Write a protein that binds this ligand. Structure first.
Ligand SMILES: [Zn+2]
Ligand SMILES: [Zn+2]
Lengths: 80, 107, 98, 362, 94, 98, 81, 95, 108, 362
DNA sequence: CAGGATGTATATATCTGACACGTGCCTGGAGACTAGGGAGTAATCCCCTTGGCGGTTAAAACGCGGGGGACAGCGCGTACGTGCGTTTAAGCGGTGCTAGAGCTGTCTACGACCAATTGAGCGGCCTCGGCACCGGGATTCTCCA
DNA sequence: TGGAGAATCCCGGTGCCGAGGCCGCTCAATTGGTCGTAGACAGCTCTAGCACCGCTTAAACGCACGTACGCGCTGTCCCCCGCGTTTTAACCGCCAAGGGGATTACTCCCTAGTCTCCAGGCACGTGTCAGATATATACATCCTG
């Protein structure tokens, strides 16, 4: 139960290509894995706190919208 | 004995609501009373901005040779203007894409 | 020899198609595995709709590709072509994230 | 009889052989001049020639002492302000323009001063005409009522050319053109969408003087669409070439066109009925014409009396709703008087009942 | 029995006003709805802070226009000022 | 020769005292001259209390010295010792200010 | 009253950058600094003018300035806050 | 006229003596503290507003205060504030 | 009747105004009804936080061998803690000073 | 008579010459051991010896089979929770600690378990004692009521040493010490501020068992201040050395101290009146003593009957408000019974009226 | 340079599922009135901001040397681009199921609101104590041997 | 290594002024009593999260080929820095004056609130069309020789 190595290196390569990259150092994969991990930890912690005061057992999308908003990452297209 | 409704949107000659808006204003816990021209002013500014957006939206979309409106067009158009991107910098857009761009040193 | 392409060339066409495309590049299964993996720490035994998951994948992909362009320009100013960790660190630094 | 129509057609062909040499010297020197325009610094850096072809069916022509070449110039974001509420002419204003449009000194407040730009354009073109004098060329100053810069050329004969500026606009495809150009059933909506995806023009021409702005009133222009629908007239679009069943549409086009040319040159009271009238007329005839069998040299006489019948039917009904603008019924007494139309019908009956006497000559 | 309000009506109205020739994927619909709402929220909170500074009990359009000027980029603000002012003066004459 | 100090040394003691100090390094007169100079564009004929002016000098000094440390670290990652404009441009860039 | 932009003395910039922890000071950066500093000032002072104007004052207080920093997300204390 | 203004400097000095009565203080930092107090309260207040909106509630209770601080503050700090808040409210129920 | 007026803060055993807080709350234009313990709750929160602040403030202050307080040591203590600094990231402080540090690369 | 006081003083000096050799061997081996403590991995990495000097006026001493060395250990942020509302003992809890304090397993919930750390400390010290055996050393396990780790040393005689842990704290200078230590007028507030700028200690000692936590109740400790105020007793602070007017303060200190030592060793009912009593007593005498002329060997007998008078005056008033803690009136019947104090006064009268018979011996 | 093979826009035809209309409904917005009290302005005052005149001294600008950090360039080695065949795990559809979010009733504690009275804190004066600050000895320092 | 001014810390007296204590007092808190209502249970109903189960298939990985990118190094060469001169001009304090914002009363107007009818959006359902899939053609490019 790790799944962080489940983000396959050529997928990361494709993503970085979409980010406009010429050459790709082979060390950066675990680096970015950890950094994205930290990011997801922030987001998911906010959304879980939301969900808790929402007294819910399932999780919705609008809580996440508020999470992104409060992290200054305002996005639409997912209701609201 | 009625005076059958002439909508305040029509009475300001606009599309955007005045009743629904004014409802949202009073039911927003902002102020106890709210002046009658404030929703008019609001609905006018917002309708103007709305149309301004939708203008460039249709522009981009027809340039892209498409039939309906997709996010890509919107992201492009927004970032192909200062004042929009100035006022809409940190907004994020699902399925909007990125502005294609490459530094000349990379060639 | 006959059509063996030079480096970057293939990557140039790729970057062209990528900046033209909008869809995701992620198999959503291990991603949401990690979602519940991070989630269970704070509290386990919770369900969710897939919409929020796709929103997460979207926002995360967006944030990282923004970082990709920022670190790209950083290495540009650094006058190199291959990535490094220090530019990424300085990116987080300038935004006060570290 | 189709043989007399072919002989006057061949007369037009010989005249076209004269126009080949004449207008080809003309086309080369204005190509040279327009090339000089792009290196000359101005707000008219990108101003290139709008080709409409070279045929009689491709350029609106008269007496050999006059010619016309269409010029195009792209324009940024443009709001369309109607003053002519019939739907034929608009005003000239911009949109927001965050960058800043470099024509504020030319902008009458918010309106666009067509006078100033036309003035400065005539200035820079006469400037360039006296800068390089390879071929014998000079600008002619005619009356300030028709904004067409005539350039007298002494090569080989005195050939003047009406320089007119058309503006390439990607602005709106206005609400006047919503229910315009109906080809949905007879031709197709697919093409129609693709067509309306393209740009359009507006010609600066001083209309009827019930207006504060003269010259700054501008009429609609879609000459690209007209040459398109010219080469795509029939139900099978591959016509006018060797691969389709050759109709008489261009034939009857030129017949009625130069019939009316000769008719106004022999009856000088009637001059307002310009070329666009028969163009919209044949468009509406086509949208009511479902069959190709009634467009062929065997049916040339039948279809031509049919065209006369259709046009005279439009005159008695007094309605000719424009093709692009069906709200704009161009059969308006304000611009074209009724008694003129009655004598026009009388001259049509003259041409009709007397075996077309103005075409026994050549 | 769960009627909810939206603005797709007025969106489509203004849309067909400036361009009666266009379809849309409904994603963008909610995008602009949410968008304008968030904008208005900034405006409302702003004017609240102003009326607080002004120690007032209600809101008219003067404070609105000033907050707009305070918040909007360049000549767009002057444009929108013209729009709002002329439409309100028009509406008072009704 | 006798006590002619090497480069940076003097600057090191300076940086020590500076990071220890908190006061400003600006003659306030041309600064507020430029304040009214920028101000008069939007509208002239306006007075002000000096408190706000000092607040301006404070906030401006603060923002620029933050940029100084950011551009410093930027040149550090760039593996140099002298400043350049491109790091500053990229700093504004990463914050979206340009 | 002209050329006050060059009232920004280079050694002030140098000492400022010293407090900013830099070591060698390229000769071109001063006008760059002046311009970037200037546009920052303009970004503040436009909204400050708008503030005092809606405040109907012929004068400038410090609270408006504070609110400018607030809306710009650069909140400051030490002057009432 | 005189416009007697509100300031927390009284209560700041109170809590100050409640922990460090030995230490002297300036008034500049005092206003800094008062201001910052107001700012965080504004953050929490607008939050609690938007949250009670998200639940469509006409009322705000201590649970919401608790969740708001927890959504705003990191780690151990949040737990301690939860403890303090809960303790003093329950105390006040017993008066 | 007419018993001695008593602060609700004593009934919460704290040093913050409860009447003033609930007043400004009701002058804050947020809700319609206000849960009786919520001002007490928030006040207790704020008391614990300002205690945490002024503690380390005076700590730093005595570590500078000083009696009264200046923005310097305050900003130092801010930029030394993890949780508080992260919370108070973009905050700017008049004469707060810079947190002194130099890169080992800048060092010989 | 001062001569008999000097002869018993010289007896204490000869005993001090014995303690020099004995306690110096002791000081070197616990220095060695404490050195071994720092290389031994533990939560007690930084634990160094708190020196208080070596004199009889610098270490609290008894029978040669016992010694004491003070150890210091720094501590992070510590909240002070009073359980002993007289003001003499507190509880042991931390503050927030964002980093995370590495003693949670030792933290009884929020309280600090003095039992566990004392247990593990005795464990690691006996571990290290059997690891290296240069000098003959072993740990003695006495009754779990006095947390002083006695280390029996067979070099040269059986010298046990009470190892006790004192915690270096920069935490609060609590509200119990606000109106404590009054030297504002007689000595100075300047020094007082500088003194309160420094750290302080707390000794883990199981008080009266009216408490849930035994051993985890901790008494206040400021031994640095005590040795400071010892070397700075007089109004001219340069005294006890060669540069000042030599008083009898250390003299009368040791006189009353070892008078009470002999007195409890010959009257075994009275043992609770430990060393700190006369220390706070002489502090209050000093704060009511304005003159240095009444502290000199010429005034030695006068000042000593004065000290007896002051202490007996405090007994009849039954108040001895502590120097650091004036709220904590240590003359409380709960810890020191009244009839004991009465017989104590009787033994003082015994020593007083009979020319001090317990000092005609040596 | 040229060909050639791959890569890609163009063009046709097909299907599907999204998108524009249609309709009934009834939920909230226009009509009309009254309260009543918040905002606009009228006079005043007071304080405070800008102008300005005269020293001073520290800071800034300008000349000057020097060495050093940047940089242009040069070998190198490896690791990351480029293909390829094998595993594999992502996604399709189905099925289902059940727990949990939404709906509705109702009643019940609870906060909103009005009166009297009070004391606390806030505006303003007294005051000593930190506390710069200049002077004067102590202690790193580093470039030189 | 010294050394030698150069900074830099540590004690002394002095203005000084301001942080903190004291007086008046006022309005906001407190108490009690009222009432409408918000949410708190309390069940009752659909849905969509998990879960599997085969099933395909392109993605990952592992491999090898090779080259070119940072890296290390050498000369070199302006360019910041350390220092002295003049200037210059920002503060330190003064007064004038006026203006402008803060305060009161009065009035007005406009929304809050009531009650009445009406249509607007929505839920749902259908008919059609936009572009994906698949295929195939024609050109854009790079790569070596
Ligand atoms: Zn043909
Ligand atoms: Zn002595």
């Amino acid at each position: 139960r790790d799944n962080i190595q489940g983000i396959t290196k050529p997928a990361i390569r494709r993503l970085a290509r979409r980010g406009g990259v010429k050459r790709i150092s082979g060390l950066i994969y675990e680096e970015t894995r950890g950094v994205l991990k930290v990011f997801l930890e922030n987001v998911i912690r906010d959304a879980v706190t939301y969900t808790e005061h929402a007294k819910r057992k399932t999780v919705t999308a609008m809580d996440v919208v508020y999470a992104l908003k409060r992290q200054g990452r305002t996005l639409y297209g997912f209701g609201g | 004995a009625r005076a059958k409704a002439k909508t305040r949107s029509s009475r300001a000659g606009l599309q955007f609501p005045v009743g629904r808006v004014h409802r949202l204003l009073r039911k927003g816990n902002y102020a106890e009373r709210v002046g009658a021209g404030a929703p008019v002013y609001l609905a006018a500014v917002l309708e103007y901005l709305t149309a301004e957006i939708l203008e460039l939206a249709g522009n981009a979309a027809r340039d892209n040779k498409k039939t309906r409106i997709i996010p890509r067009h919107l992201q492009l158009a927004i970032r192909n203007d200062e004042e929009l991107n100035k006022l809409l910098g940190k907004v994020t857009i699902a399925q909007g894409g990125v502005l294609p761009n490459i530094q000349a040193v990379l060639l | 020899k006959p059509h063996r392409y030079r480096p970057g060339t293939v990557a140039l066409r790729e970057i062209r198609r990528y900046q033209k495309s909008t869809e995701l590049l992620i198999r959503k299964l291990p991603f949401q595995r990690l979602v519940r993996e991070i989630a269970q720490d704070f509290k386990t035994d919770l369900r969710f709709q897939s919409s929020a998951v796709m929103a997460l994948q979207e926002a995360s992909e967006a944030y990282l590709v923004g970082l990709f362009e920022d670190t790209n320009l950083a290495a540009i100013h650094a006058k190199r072509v291959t990535i490094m960790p220090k530019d990424i660190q300085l990116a987080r630094r300038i935004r006060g994230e570290r | 009889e189709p043989d007399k129509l072919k002989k006057v057609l061949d007369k037009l062909r010989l005249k076209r052989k004269d126009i080949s040499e004449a207008a080809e010297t003309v086309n080369k020197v204005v190509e040279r001049l327009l090339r000089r325009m792009q290196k000359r610094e101005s707000e008219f850096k990108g101003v290139e020639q709008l080709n409409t072809g070279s045929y009689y069916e491709h350029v609106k022509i008269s007496a050999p002492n006059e010619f016309d070449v269409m010029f195009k110039l792209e324009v940024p974001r443009i709001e369309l302000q109607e003053y002519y509420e019939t739907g034929a002419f608009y005003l000239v204003k911009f949109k927001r323009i965050p960058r800043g449009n470099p024509l504020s000194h030319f902008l009458e407040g918010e309106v666009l001063s067509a006078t100033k730009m036309l003035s400065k354009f005539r200035k820079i073109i006469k400037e360039e005409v006296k800068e390089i004098k390879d071929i014998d060329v000079s600008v002619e100053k005619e009356k300030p009522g028709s904004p067409a810069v005539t350039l007298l050329i002494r090569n080989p004969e005195e050939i003047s050319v009406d320089i007119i500026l058309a503006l390439e606009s990607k602005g709106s495809w206005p609400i006047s053109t919503k229910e315009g150009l109906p080809i949905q059933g007879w031709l197709g909506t697919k093409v129609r969408t693709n067509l309306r995806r393209e740009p359009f023009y507006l010609v600066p021409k001083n209309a009827k003087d019930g207006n504060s702005f003269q010259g700054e009133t501008w009429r609609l222009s879609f000459s690209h669409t007209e040459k398109y629908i010219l080469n795509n007239h029939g139900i099978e679009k591959t016509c006018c070439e060797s691969s389709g069943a050759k109709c008489c549409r261009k034939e009857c086009l030129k017949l009625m066109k130069y019939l009316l040319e000769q008719l106004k040159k022999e009856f000088q009271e009637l001059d307002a009925f310009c070329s666009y009238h028969v163009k919209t007329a044949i468009f509406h005839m086509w949208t009511q014409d479902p069959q190709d069998s009634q467009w062929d040299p065997r049916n040339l006489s039948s279809c031509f009396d049919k065209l006369l019948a259709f046009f005279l039917e439009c005159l008695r009904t007094e309605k000719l709703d424009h093709y692009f603008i069906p709200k704009f019924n161009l059969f308006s007494q304000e611009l074209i008087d009724r008694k003129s139309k009655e004598f026009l019908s009388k001259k049509i009956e003259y041409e009709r009942n007397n075996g077309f006497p103005i075409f026994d000559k050549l | 029995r769960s009627r909810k309000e939206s603005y797709s009506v007025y969106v489509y109205k203004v849309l067909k006003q400036v361009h009666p020739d266009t379809g849309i994927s409904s994603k963008a619909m909610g995008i602009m709805n949410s968008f304008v709402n968030d904008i208005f929220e900034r405006i409302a909170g702003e004017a609240s802070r102003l009326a607080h500074y002004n120690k007032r009990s209600t809101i008219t359009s003067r404070e609105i226009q000033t907050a707009v000027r305070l918040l909007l980029p360049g000549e767009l603000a002057k444009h929108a000022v013209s729009e709002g002012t002329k439409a309100v003066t028009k509406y008072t004459s009704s």
